[PDB]
């Protein structure tokens, strides 16, 4: 609940092939940053952790998807 | 990294070496990733029919 | 209200079972319906507005015999009964397509009527949210990466449709997953008849722009500009008449949200230019905000497990694209059929559904013509442009296209020739017409080769066997090449049964009687001349003294057996005029010389009569027949409702019910004399013959009672329900159906009268799909049993979890989703059907769920004065 639903994270596959003296493109005092950041996993990780322990429990599993046979 | 060659060095020239990469071995595919991500050689013994 | 019973305490429950009880109890209180029956099947069955128009009758029916391996393989070997039913109600039971989805998915898109359809498949919910993809998540129960691939719908991804001087399409933002339908308004103002100009979305403020001359003009390039200012297209070079030209071009809001004019400036080498223009305007609209196609893709795609991308394929490869009707559902039942009875791609069942091999390459997929034709690239790709009239004939060369096409289907140059012919018997020239259409053909010919186990040479002898010989699939439709593939489905499944090749097969259906004078035969005609020297016409009955010498000339048959081989020889006539024994006789003790190939051509006439009268032997022997099935088959066809004025036909279908005949006389056993008698008169009944074939006496009489009460393509008569084949045969259908479903044949006519499309359109109330599950779950094992239950409370959770969100659900308790009924109701649904429970279980997890809810402050107002309590 308190994470929501997981963001739609599309991945870009647009790459202008710069040159390295044209890609010294800096900061001093089609895309304004010539790379693009990553996923950032371990947060993404937050729903696939819950994901797999409420599966488990809908299945009947234990915390390693063993089965298991309580009364 | 799958393959056999004389060695480069410089008394190493007469020793055929043999090599295999453990990405093609394929060992943890043998159990199901929930029994544990962390997968270590603990010990390695060599047979040579 | 929960009683503290023992049972409530110590019975073992599945779970969700009791979460559907209770969703059932909360829906059936609205709407007031009198019971959990008419919630599940007049409520759940034709509400299109959720999740699913869940049928449950459809579902329970459905899985039943999917528990029952053969996948309705059982009822296709059974004519008798499949012929009852319309091929749509066994297709739809494979493809998992409910009445009522069908009768959605049939429907079709009229522009005009897209707020009404909308309103009919969809609750009052603005298209502004459903249209996102965080509403499309929920309504549809989909992941986004599946979101993701339901792009394009329009007629194409491609070349897109124009009319009433418009198009209409979605564009989805790369970014935000936002989707807008667009129209691009294109109205001429000058020369439209000059050339043309096509612009199509490709992104937000990205456009494809097409172009087509219908006058040439020597330019020296082309120039099309916005507004006649900015560049957007440019050209080098004169382009051409009928032929399309595009680039991808930007056009922002200042371009395209006013009415704005693409002029097309043909510039000569001279100062001088042509000029064609038309009117665009692009812009969003609401009105459009509807893709319908879109709701019938998702289901249809969910129904049959099948990726979008393939689906497209499927069902643009067939008909008019951007939409879905009943002519590709036709295509993709038949596709499933297909994929489901063989190991094959669903690209290959593609094709055997009469459909082209795709040179259309898409979503990181190469196409199926170069997968098929230039994965071999022999120094250069083979086109399929019509120009390239490689000659594909035995004894002849060509270029190395002629070795792609030799490798794409992976046969020898006199096979690829006979398959060349297969597809067009009339193509006797040294030449491929180098389309899709005959490829397509070659490769259905290959494909039926080798999902049958059959030779391409087998492929003309089966065909002659089956009695399709000289079939052109360049002109067959695809309701013949359906059927002429399921009589192969019986056909060479039955030599895959009986062990028998294509070629025996052949000659055992083969009437050319070769004719010749040789020793192998001759001496077969002197053997029965000497043996009938001291005999004559007029002395002795020549049917008579003439099968023994037959039956121990020819391949060590009894007399009887002879007997019946010289009448089927007769009736067949294995001559050039027709051709008896007595003519056989009157043609050896005339112009005839013991020894002597000739005399008169009548000595070829004699020599065909003897192969003829082998060739029933040989059959006799290959189908196990007895000598008094024998006797009846040939001599007295009349009560197998067959040839009947004649022995029966050499046709492989009268050969294949020969043997399955011979096996019911095999099963008679020792009886089998007396019911052949009793067969050939009218002395058979119920008991009698289940006594013979080791059936039960009722089972064998409910048989006949639907055999003959039902009507058939074996018509059956109930004077004669017992003593003539077709109606035998009949029985024992409804008799193997009954007992592979354990449910007594009033039980099996009950999955008969279902359809889809019906031909005389009585579609099923739901009480005939009520009647047939329940006749149907109770021929299972507990084994099987439990699966189905556990299956159907899965789905069943999932079906009124989705109804009870959108209808009953008040909008006090903010629940969204099925997570949040469960903290809601207290209860789960997602928890599979595996769980076991009690009904005081469940009541103590709903209260301790309650409460730690209440103490942990996730409820926002539990009372004080309560929760200080020591408890």
Redesign the interface.
Known sequence: HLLGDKPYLPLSTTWSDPRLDRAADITTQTLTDLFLPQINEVMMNYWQTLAQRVYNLRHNLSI???PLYLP | NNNLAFGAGTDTKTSLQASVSFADLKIREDY?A???KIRRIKQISVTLP | SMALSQQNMDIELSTLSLSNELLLESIKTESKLENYTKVMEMLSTFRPSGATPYHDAYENVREVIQLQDPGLEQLNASPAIAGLMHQASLLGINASISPELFNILTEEITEGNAEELYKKNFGNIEPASLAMPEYLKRYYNLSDEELSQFIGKASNFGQQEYSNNQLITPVVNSSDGTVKVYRITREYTTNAYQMDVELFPFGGENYRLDYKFKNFYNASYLSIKLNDKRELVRTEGAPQVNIEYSANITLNTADISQPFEIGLTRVLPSGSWAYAAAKFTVEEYNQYSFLLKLNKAIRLSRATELSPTILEGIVRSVNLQLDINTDVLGKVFLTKYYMQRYAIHAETALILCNAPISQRSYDNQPSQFDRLFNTPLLNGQYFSTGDEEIDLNSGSTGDWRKTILKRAFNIDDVSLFRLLKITDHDNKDGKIKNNLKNLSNLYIGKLLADIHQLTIDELDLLLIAVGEGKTNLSAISDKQLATLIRKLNTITSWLHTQKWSVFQLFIMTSTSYNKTLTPEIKNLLDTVYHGLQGFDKDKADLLHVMAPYIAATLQLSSENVAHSVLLWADKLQPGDGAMTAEKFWDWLNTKYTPGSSEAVETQEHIVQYCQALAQLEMVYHSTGINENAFRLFVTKPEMFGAATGAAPAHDALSLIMLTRFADWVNALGEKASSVLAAFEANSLTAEQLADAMNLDANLLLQASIQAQNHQHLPPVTPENAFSCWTSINTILQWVNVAQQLNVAPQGVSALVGLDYIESMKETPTYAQWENAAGVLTAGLNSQQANTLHAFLDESRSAALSTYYIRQVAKAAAAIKSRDDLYQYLLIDNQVSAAIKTTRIAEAIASIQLYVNRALENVEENANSGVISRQF
């Open positions: 390693d998807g063993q | 199901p929930s029994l544990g």
